[PDB]
Design a protein around this nucleic acid. Structure first.
Ligand SMILES: [Mg+2]
Lengths: 49, 147, 1316, 44, 392
DNA sequence: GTCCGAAGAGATTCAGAG
DNA sequence: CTCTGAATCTCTTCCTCGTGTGGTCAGGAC
RNA sequence: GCAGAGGUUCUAGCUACACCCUCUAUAAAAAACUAAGGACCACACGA
């Protein structure tokens, strides 16, 4: 979105971890988005976990 | 007030210009003037637009917004004087620059909004919560805006 | 009377107003500016010599060596303009300077110089501007654009509402130099004047004042009124001058002369003020608390001991009152404070002022400017006196001083370029008054504060920067003052000057690439007034204010013509008549109005001058007697439209077409259409394309001829005479006797330029519009260039247009052109493409251009010659080979896919050191043959004229019938005359004739070896071959195409001619516009244009009928005369009586296609005039015909408008925008085209596209787009191999761009892991 | 005091206006506790 | 994928923590950012393990103060200078003890400003100790490099191989590191090694983000260098240009026009760009039908656009939706799908009624066209994208 | 052959008042 | 006097696509 | 046809995304065929 340096630094120092579960995150990583025709795929994935 | 009177006269002459022969006596009905057909039908052109086309151009503002004491007497059918055209160009360039900057800021706002609500996805058939919103018709002093 | 050109087609012209000032040279703003740059201008003004004189004097520390400037000469250009455009070299001229190196006598520098020396020293290269107002830098006509920037001079900005979050409008004063540091005086929201040098950290006011060697007493005396108080033996009798009684209340018993005046609980009325003034009082009795609230002015010490009673600006108090009283110091000066009259703004700055003395002020200034290092006294003092007191760093140009003294009411105009302390304190006082209501702020948008820097000034500034770099170098060299060793050439080098000037004219912010596609575009891109550029705004920094048209743009800057989009307003175009001022402001022509009667005297006025004057509108009834019948004639007051009296006016507008640009002066009926659509049309009028055969506008503006003659597109006759020999390539003009040069006269060969690539890849073509034996005069037009017709401007063409919805094909805005347009080749446009190819110094054998290509069949070698270059005129298509370029081990330049068409010309440049190959040999041979042909052509006819000159003396009394034609041709001199010395005169003239042939042959060989020379190129290339593809693009369903009234459309379907709706006569209308684009997009002018075009074509066919079937000259002449005289009060008054009775037939032939109409933009034909013109032809007055349908063959109800709108054809074709990619190139990030989708790259599924896709829920489609269709190279090739097998599977994979991001954000210590 | 796109931007940005109306977070009697010593006081 | 590490001759600060808005180095060391900058850039010393002398472990002193303190205690007092000093201060600090002590004084120091600042610092300390990373790793002693292919030399003309505006940054860092290593090998006087280490730190700053401190360095054409943070942040950064908005294959563009003869689920499509789009589909159909045997033969056949190719193309576009798309798409009705009908000319033809949604204006407007490929994606386009399914 | 504006938003300093 | 607040400086983002025009990118010395 | 080489063409051709045949240390009876490709800023604009 914005202020990539700020958020990246805050995530780094905090040791933050991303549990994607989101539209833009999956878009960046390229997997199915958890909203639409991929919602069933993602619900199955979270069911397996 | 003069502009409003001019608009009313222009309409009352244009929207019934057809005075046709009714098998005998004379009757007048909604005119078939092509401009009025394209305006009244809602095809292209509003009543204010056709008024500023045929009747008065009304008044128009300076850059700040304070309108000129001397309005645009003429219209677009007949000739338009030089000073009147300069006064018109004031508002025309104002709107044009505004619309370009509008597209810029609106694109930015759209990105901001869609990146704040990107992750919200419907994921349950019901939440089972009685809590809601006491939705009512909106009356902000005037009549009902949204029934 | 009319010149011979318009005598063959006299443009029918409306417009009642008799124009008093003809349209000036439209390129004057460029040409005059550059000519001013290249001149020796004294008395300050901008010249190249001026910069020379202001930079060359060099002082040396103990070197005793100085540099003196004498003169500068620009050498003859190395290559002509056309040659430069062919090669690529900059059309320049060497800058030969005659510098003087002088060393004064050692042990006595006060004496003269002991060793002087003069040498014509090189300085660099100055790119000259050709006659057309263009620069040719890298062989491309690269025109400059004049810049409009905030002029130097103090400006008192308002800055309303923004800060303090209170609406309290502070007042900041800004004084911008021309070359220096911006200085800001700003007010604290707490009302404390703050100085801001270079907009840097805020700093209190008095530090600058203290840095001016001031003290607190002096500052307080300069800034405030002093209330005098005296110590008298009765409680220190107070003194109050009654002038300070402006609406103050009386907290005390106002009394004097033993008489009470104002009691408690009252304010002093102005009547009481004048009563006190007439009482002639100075003293008054107030309680001592009143003086306590005052503030002391001057420093006071106890003379009994010498200790400070109280410092300056120290508030009084009871203890301080006692310290004053018991000290015997009878003198008290208090600061007169008042919220209304004189607020105490500097006193609070002193309260805030941390610095005390001048040294501390300098130290603080040095700290804020250069932080960190210890602020040495010498360093700080030098910084201040070099920042605001040195001509070397703070030179306000004469315009800056003029604006400064104007805005500070000082009557002086000229002065030094620096700021005296008086200037600083005056700016302080003016800002304080602005805060105190006296005097008002000024708006930057006002054209009296925005200056115009043309090419000359910007180039001169860049040249001065280069010169200060060079003078630094000269001082560096002069550290070792060698004498009698080096001539005045070695101490300098032309490299810095050349670098600066070349960078400014090439890779620079305003050295724009001229958009050569229409003479209108050529002109309007030179009159462009850009607010961008160095020292100016940006497309993002600009706000709503600067965009909008100020009420002073009237007649100075066109408010209509303006690039829509991001750079709206910033790049407005100069209006028609608005020449630049001497200083740099915008003057506009106005007519002096003596009381009662307007005169013809033209008085150019700047915006500041205009406000004071009263300007009447051009569209008023003067009739050359003035005395506007309208006693309430509309006038322009101080920036406000306000109707005035008849005698109250002082100036009047010059012409009704003054307020618009030339790009908008072309638009007919500009009165009617809205300014939005007018701007759109004037922008899409610069974007036409030169049509195959140009066609005059059936309804123009009469000034298109001016814009077509002033531009360089049309070869104008600089010398009147009779056309001796015309040709499609050259025009030979036989000069008349009156215009002859004294001796060695002859012809004037206007060598036309045939098809040459433009900048926008259009055909710069010239067509001779004359015949063998038709006289031409001065300023005549000979060769119609691109988009010109008989000297007029014909951007597009004109065809029948009917406004009706035709089965939705013209649904929203789309045009529906008939197949008749394409069939008659009406809109075909030549496009010239260029395919460069170079031969580089590759190791183990250079790049050689040979037909010895491997792995190619005879089809590849077909179009190529025996030396690897395609023949001139091969119908090449996509992928075909044109240039060999065998590299050491096949890099053949091939036709990029899509582009097609013939190849017109190949140019083979070559630097010395490599022998030209066979095709290059043939090219050189034909070029030298052409050069010799041209030279011999200008030899033989010139010698014939020279013998005619010599035959004149052999016919001036001594005429010899056979004795003349009995001596050989080379000797028509030695014959029988009556002089007794003419015999020897003729023998020596024959000797001169032999020498003349010698100089002619030497010129021929000079041109030959100019061609034969090795063309120096970029470092590392052997020889460049340039190939010119020449496609033939025409109308197809998708070419953007518009009329002049901003009615932009796109072709929808090439409708068969039968389908087109035909009128009663059966003439099918070629175009069916969409009517519904008129009301909303309010451009009703295009319908007035349509009706007038219909009337014009009615006149055309009316005369065509009586010319098709032969009718005598009398009937046609009377009809043409009546057609011209029908106008109500038209100024043209064309009479056909004076015509030769045979050129009237030529006029009719040029008129049979349609009577060209001219309606000046704001004085066009009214309803009655166009109606009468329609009724003259056998045409309906209503302007609407009954178009029978082309398919149904049934009458259209509601008869529809039919007329000849002048439809352009915009450059935005479709075959250069029809793009599609299956799979092609990829990048380091595996994006396809990355930077430029022109390399057969796919579209960008942009940022908003993924949102618009995931809003549906297209997870599979989105995953496709951003993993397997674009990024996942392994998955991409796997899915390709999958699809070519019928199966349509998919593999997600990892987006390689995400891997790039992973590695990048992992390469900076932030560990990233795809942890599972 | 703007009624266009900046109004929507200001709303969705939750920008407190430069002159915001001040409200009381607790219900009760209004008073001026201090004697406006620097600024006025409101005690509920 | 391969990376390389630059063994810094001395530890150097990480800009993303120094002179940043979060100012992590500020909260962590409880120092002013100004003072941290001063010690790192070698303007002033910072003390470590002062001990008996009055200077504590967290004080900042000038060079004259350094001389005076050296007089106070010759060796027990230590004032390391530069980034090594910050490294040592981070080493000496223990998170857990400091975290619990900060919690202790947070429970008592009720000052609202102090409460906010202490909560910020304690949040940083807790999220930094519970997360598996030590505070020493803020000071990067070993800079890694990008993979060389992610940072290549592009051209061959003019100046042979130009740079990537990052190779020069890494070269500057390497050169400064090499000169510092040479100075440490030659034991140069401390002032010149201070200058060398300071400019090494500045070069590392420019590499990390050219423009976070002072005059952004430039040696190529007087413009700021595209640092690593430049390639990540902003529109031009990877996140937005190259990740969310990847340019796609099987796509095309053309100025669009109106065709009434079309249906609502249809759109015009030039035969040229349709052929250029579905080339893999054409290859597959030709290979199935036997009109060609290899992809070379199919490429030749489609490049000659035989009449056997057109009727095969109209066969493969029987029920294959394509995603029309306008460039300034705002609502999701800005990208629909249609069954494209093969027509002559160079312009996509859009149904009139679906121009109101597109905001199409037919005055030279260009619409991108995209082709779903996988049958799940084509079916998804048919079910959702197609205009007859999103009328509301 | 190889090598030296503007707008806001937030973090951060002054101050001024208890 | 020290802490809620006044200011101060500073940093990030500003439709998204195209057609395109160009301009640009590490030497001499040992 | 998955690690190499050879073959009738045309230096070289072993699935390199890639096109035919042979075998595990040996080179020819054989026609359709071949190359995996490129960055950053300013400007005219256009919707
Ligand atoms: Mg449009």
């Amino acid at each position: 979105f914005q202020e990539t340096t700020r958020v990246l630094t805050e995530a780094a120092v905090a040791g933050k971890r991303d549990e994607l579960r989101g539209l833009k995150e999956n878009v960046i990583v390229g997997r199915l988005i958890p909203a639409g025709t991929g919602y069933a795929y993602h619900q199955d994935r979270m069911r397996r976990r | 007030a003069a502009n409003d009177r001019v608009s009313k006269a222009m309409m009352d002459n244009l929207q019934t210009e057809t005075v046709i022969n009714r098998d005998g006596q004379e009757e007048k009905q909604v005119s078939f003037n092509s401009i009025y057909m394209m305006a009244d039908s809602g095809a292209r052109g509003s009543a204010a637009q056709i008024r500023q086309l045929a009747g008065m151009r009304g008044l128009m503002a300076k850059p700040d917004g304070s309108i000129i004491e001397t309005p645009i007497t003429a219209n677009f059918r007949e000739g338009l004087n030089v000073l009147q055209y300069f006064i018109s160009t004031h508002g025309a360039r104002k709107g044009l620059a505004d619309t370009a900057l509008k597209t810029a800021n609106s694109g930015y706002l759209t990105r901001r909004l869609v990146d704040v609500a990107q992750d919200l996805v419907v994921t349950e058939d019901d939440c089972g919560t009685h809590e809601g919103i006491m939705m009512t018709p909106v009356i902000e002093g005037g009549d009902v805006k949204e029934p | 009377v009319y010149s011979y050109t318009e005598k063959k087609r006299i443009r029918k012209d409306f417009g009642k107003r008799p124009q008093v000032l003809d349209v000036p040279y439209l390129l004057s703003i460029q040409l005059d500016s550059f000519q001013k740059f290249i001149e020796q201008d004294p008395e300050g003004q901008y010249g190249l010599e001026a910069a020379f004189r202001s930079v060359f004097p060099i002082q040396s520390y103990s070197g005793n060596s100085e540099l003196q400037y004498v003169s500068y000469r620009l050498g003859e250009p190395v290559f002509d303009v056309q040659e430069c455009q062919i090669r690529g070299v900059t059309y320049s001229a060497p800058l030969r300077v005659k510098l003087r190196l002088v060393i004064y006598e050692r042990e006595a520098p006060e004496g003269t110089v002991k060793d002087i020396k003069e040498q014509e020293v090189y300085m660099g290269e100055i790119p000259l501007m050709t006659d057309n107002g263009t620069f040719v830098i890298n062989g491309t006509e690269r025109v400059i654009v004049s810049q409009l920037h905030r002029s130097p001079g103090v400006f008192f900005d308002s800055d309303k509402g923004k800060t303090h979050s209170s609406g309290k409008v502070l007042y900041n004063a800004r004084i911008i130099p021309y070359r220096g540091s911006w200085l800001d005086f700003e007010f604290d929201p707490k009302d404390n004047l703050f100085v801001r040098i270079d907009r840097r950290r805020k700093l209190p006011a008095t530090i600058i004042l203290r840095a001016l060697n001031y003290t607190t007493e002096q500052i307080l005396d300069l800034f405030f009124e002093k209330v005098i108080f005296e110590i008298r033996d009765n409680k220190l009798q107070m003194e109050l001058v009654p002038e300070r009684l402006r609406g103050e209340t009386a907290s005390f018993d106002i009394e004097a002369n033993g008489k009470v005046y104002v009691e408690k609980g009252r304010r002093i009325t102005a009547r009481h003020i004048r009563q006190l003034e007439k009482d002639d009082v100075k003293l008054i009795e107030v309680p001592v608390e009143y003086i306590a609230g005052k503030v002391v002015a001057k420093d006071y010490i106890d003379e009994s001991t010498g200790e400070l009673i109280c410092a300056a600006n120290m508030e009084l108090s009871l203890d301080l009152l006692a310290k004053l009283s018991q000290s015997g110091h009878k003198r008290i000066e208090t600061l007169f404070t008042n919220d209304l009259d004189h607020g105490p703004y500097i006193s609070e700055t002193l309260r805030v002022d941390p610095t005390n003395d001048r040294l501390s002020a300098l130290v603080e200034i040095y700290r804020m400017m250069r932080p960190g290092e210890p602020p040495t006294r010498e360093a700080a003092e030098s910084l201040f006196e070099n920042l605001f007191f040195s001509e070397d760093r703070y030179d306000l140009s004469a315009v800056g001083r003029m604006k400064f003294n104007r805005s500070l009411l000082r009557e002086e105009i000229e002065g030094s370029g620096i700021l005296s302390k008086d200037d600083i304190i005056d700016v302080m006082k003016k800002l304080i008054d602005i805060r105190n209501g006296k005097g008002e702020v000024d708006d930057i948008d006002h054209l009296g504060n925005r200056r115009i820097r043309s090419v000359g000034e910007m180039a001169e500034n860049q040249f001065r920067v280069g010169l200060v770099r060079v003078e630094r170098a000269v001082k560096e060299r002069l550290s070792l003052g060698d004498l009698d060793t080096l001539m005045p050439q070695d101490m300098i080098n032309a490299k810095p000057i050349s670098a600066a000037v070349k960078e400014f004219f090439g890779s620079s912010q305003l050295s724009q690439f001229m958009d050569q596609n229409n003479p209108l575009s050529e002109i309007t891109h030179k009159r462009r007034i850009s607010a961008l550029g160095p020292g100016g705004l940006t497309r993002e920094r600009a706000g709503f204010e600067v965009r909008d048209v100020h009420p002073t743009h009237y007649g100075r800057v066109c408010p209509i013509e303006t690039p829509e989009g991001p750079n709206i307003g910033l790049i407005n175009s100069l209006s028609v008549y608005a020449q630049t001022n001497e200083y740099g402001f915008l003057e506009t022509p106005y007519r002096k109005v003596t009381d009662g009667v307007v005169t013809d005297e033209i008085h150019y006025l700047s915006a500041i001058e205009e406000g004071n004057y009263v300007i009447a509108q051009a569209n008023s009834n003067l009739d050359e007697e003035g005395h506007f019948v309208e006693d309430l004639v509309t006038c322009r007051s101080k920036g406000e439209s306000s109707l005035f009296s008849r005698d109250q006016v002082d100036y009047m507008d010059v012409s009704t077409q003054q307020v618009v640009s030339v790009g908008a002066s072309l638009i007919p009926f500009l009165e009617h259409d809205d300014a939005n659509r007018a701007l759109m049309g004037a922008n899409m009028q610069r974007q036409a394309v030169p049509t195959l055969r140009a066609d005059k506008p059936l309804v123009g503006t009469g000034m298109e001829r001016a814009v077509a003659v002033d531009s360089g597109v049309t070869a104008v006759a600089k010398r009147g005479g009779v056309v001796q020999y015309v040709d499609a390539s050259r025009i030979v003009i036989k000069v008349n006797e009156d215009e002859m040069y004294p001796g060695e006269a002859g012809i004037d060969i206007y060598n036309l330029t045939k098809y040459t690539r433009s900048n926008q890849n259009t055909c710069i073509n010239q067509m001779p519009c004359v015949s063998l034996g038709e006289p031409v005069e001065r300023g005549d037009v000979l060769a119609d260039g691109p988009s010109t017709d008989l000297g007029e401007l014909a951007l597009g063409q004109n065809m029948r247009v009917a406004f009706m919805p035709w089965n939705g094909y013209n649904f929203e805005d789309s045009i529906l052109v008939s197949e008749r347009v394409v069939q008659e080749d009406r809109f075909t446009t030549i496009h010239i493409q260029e395919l460069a190819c170079v031969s580089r110094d590759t190791k183990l054998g250079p790049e050689e251009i040979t037909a010895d290509i491997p792995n190619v069949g005879e089809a590849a070698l077909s179009k190529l010659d025996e030396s690897g270059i395609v023949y001139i005129g091969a119908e090449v298509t996509g992928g075909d080979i044109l240039v060999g370029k065998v590299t050491p081990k096949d890099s053949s330049l091939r036709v990029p896919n899509g582009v097609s068409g013939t190849v017109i010309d190949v140019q083979v440049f070559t630097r010395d050191g490599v022998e030209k190959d066979k095709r290059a040999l043939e090219i050189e041979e034909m070029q030298l043959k052409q050069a010799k042909k041209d030279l011999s052509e200008e030899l033989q006819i010139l010698e014939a004229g020279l013998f005619s000159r010599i035959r004149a003396v052999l016919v001036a009394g001594g005429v010899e019938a056979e004795k003349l034609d009995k001596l050989p041709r080379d000797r028509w001199l030695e014959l029988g005359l009556t002089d007794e010395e003419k015999q020897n005169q003729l023998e020596q003239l024959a000797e001169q004739y032999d020498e003349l042939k010698h100089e002619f042959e030497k010129k021929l060989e000079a041109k030959r070896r100019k061609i034969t020379q090795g063309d120096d190129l970029a470092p590392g290339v052997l020889k460049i071959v340039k190939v010119y593809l020449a496609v033939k693009r025409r109308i197809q369903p998708g070419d953007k195409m518009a009329g002049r009234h901003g009615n932009k459309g796109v072709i929808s379907k090439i409708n068969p001619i039968e389908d087109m709706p035909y009128d009663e006569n059966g003439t099918p209308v070629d175009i069916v516009l969409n009517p519904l684009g008129v009301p909303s997009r309010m451009n009703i002018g295009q319908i007035l244009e349509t009706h007038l075009g219909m009337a014009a074509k009615g006149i055309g066919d009316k005369i065509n009928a009586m010319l098709k079937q032969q009718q005598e000259v009398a009937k046609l002449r009377e009809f043409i005369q009546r057609a011209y005289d029908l106008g109500a009060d038209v100024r043209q008054k064309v009479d056909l009586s004076t015509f030769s009775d045979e050129e009237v037939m030529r006029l009719a032939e040029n008129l049979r296609k349609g009577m060209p109409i001219a309606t000046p933009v704001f004085d066009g034909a009214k309803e009655a005039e166009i109606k009468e013109l329609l009724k003259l032809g056998d045409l309906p007055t209503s302007g609407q015909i009954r178009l029978y349908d082309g398919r149904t063959g049934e009458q259209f109800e509601r008869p529809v408008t039919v007329g000849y709108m002048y439809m352009l054809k915009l450059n935005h074709l479709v075959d250069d925008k029809m793009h599609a990619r299956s799979t092609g190139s990829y990048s380091l990030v595996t994006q396809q085209p990355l930077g430029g989708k022109a390399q057969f790259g796919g579209q960008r599924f942009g940022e908003m596209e993924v949102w618009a896709l995931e809003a549906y829920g297209a997870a599979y489609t989105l995953q496709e787009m951003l993993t397997v269709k674009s990024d996942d190279v392994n998955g991409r090739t796997k899915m390709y191999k999958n699809i070519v097998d019928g199966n349509h599977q998919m593999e997600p994979g990892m987006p390689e761009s995400f891997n790039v991001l992973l590695k990048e954000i992992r390469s900076l210590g932030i560990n990233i892991e795809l942890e599972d | 005091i703007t009624g266009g796109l900046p109004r929507v931007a200001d709303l969705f940005e939750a920008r407190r206006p430069k002159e915001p109306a001040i409200l009381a977070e607790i219900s009760g009697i209004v008073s001026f506790g201090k004697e406006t010593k620097g600024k006025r006081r409101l005690v509920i | 994928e391969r990376m390389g590490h630059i063994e810094l001759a001395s530890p150097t600060a990480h800009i993303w923590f120094l002179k940043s808005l979060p100012s992590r180095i500020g909260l962590l060391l409880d120092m002013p950012l100004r003072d941290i900058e001063r010690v790192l850039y070698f303007e002033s010393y910072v003390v470590i393990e002062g001990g008996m002398t009055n200077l504590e472990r967290q004080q900042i002193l000038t060079e004259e103060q350094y001389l005076d303190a050296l007089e106070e205690f010759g060796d027990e007092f230590d004032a390391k200078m530069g980034a090594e000093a910050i490294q040592a201060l981070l080493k000496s600090m223990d998170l857990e003890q400091e975290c619990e002590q900060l919690r202790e004084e947070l429970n008592e120091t009720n000052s609202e400003t102090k409460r906010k600042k202490l909560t910020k610092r304690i949040k940083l300390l807790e999220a930094f100790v519970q997360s598996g990373n030590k505070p020493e790793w803020m000071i990067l002693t070993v800079l890694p490099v990008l993979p060389p292919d992610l940072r290549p030399l592009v051209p061959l003309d003019g100046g042979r191989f130009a740079t990537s505006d990052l190779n020069d940054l890494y070269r500057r860092v390497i050169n400064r590191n090499n000169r510092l290593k040479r100075l440490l090998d030659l034991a140069a006087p401390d002032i010149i090694v201070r200058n060398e280490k300071r400019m090494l730190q500045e070069a590392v700053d420019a590499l990390l983000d050219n423009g976070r401190r002072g005059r952004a360095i430039t040696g190529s054409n007087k413009r700021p260098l595209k640092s690593l943070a430049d390639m990540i942040k902003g529109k031009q950064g990877r996140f937005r240009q190259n990740l969310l908005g990847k340019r796609v294959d099987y796509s095309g563009r053309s100025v669009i026009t109106v065709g009434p003869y079309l249906r609502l689920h249809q759109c015009g499509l030039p035969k040229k760009m349709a052929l250029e789009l579905f080339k893999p589909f054409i290859y597959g159909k030709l290979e199935l039908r036997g009109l060609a045997t290899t992809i070379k033969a199919a490429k030749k056949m489609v490049e000659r656009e035989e009449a056997v190719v057109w009727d095969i193309l109209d066969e493969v576009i029987r029920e294959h939706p394509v995603l029309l798309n306008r460039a300034p798409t705002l609502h999701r009705l800005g990208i629909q799908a249609f069954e494209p009908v093969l027509i002559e000319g160079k312009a996509i033809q859009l149904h009139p009624l679906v121009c109101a949604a597109y905001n199409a204006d037919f005055d030279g407007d260009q619409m991108a066209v995209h082709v779903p490929l996988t049958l799940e994606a084509q079916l998804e386009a048919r079910a959702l994208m197609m205009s007859t399914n999103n009328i509301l």
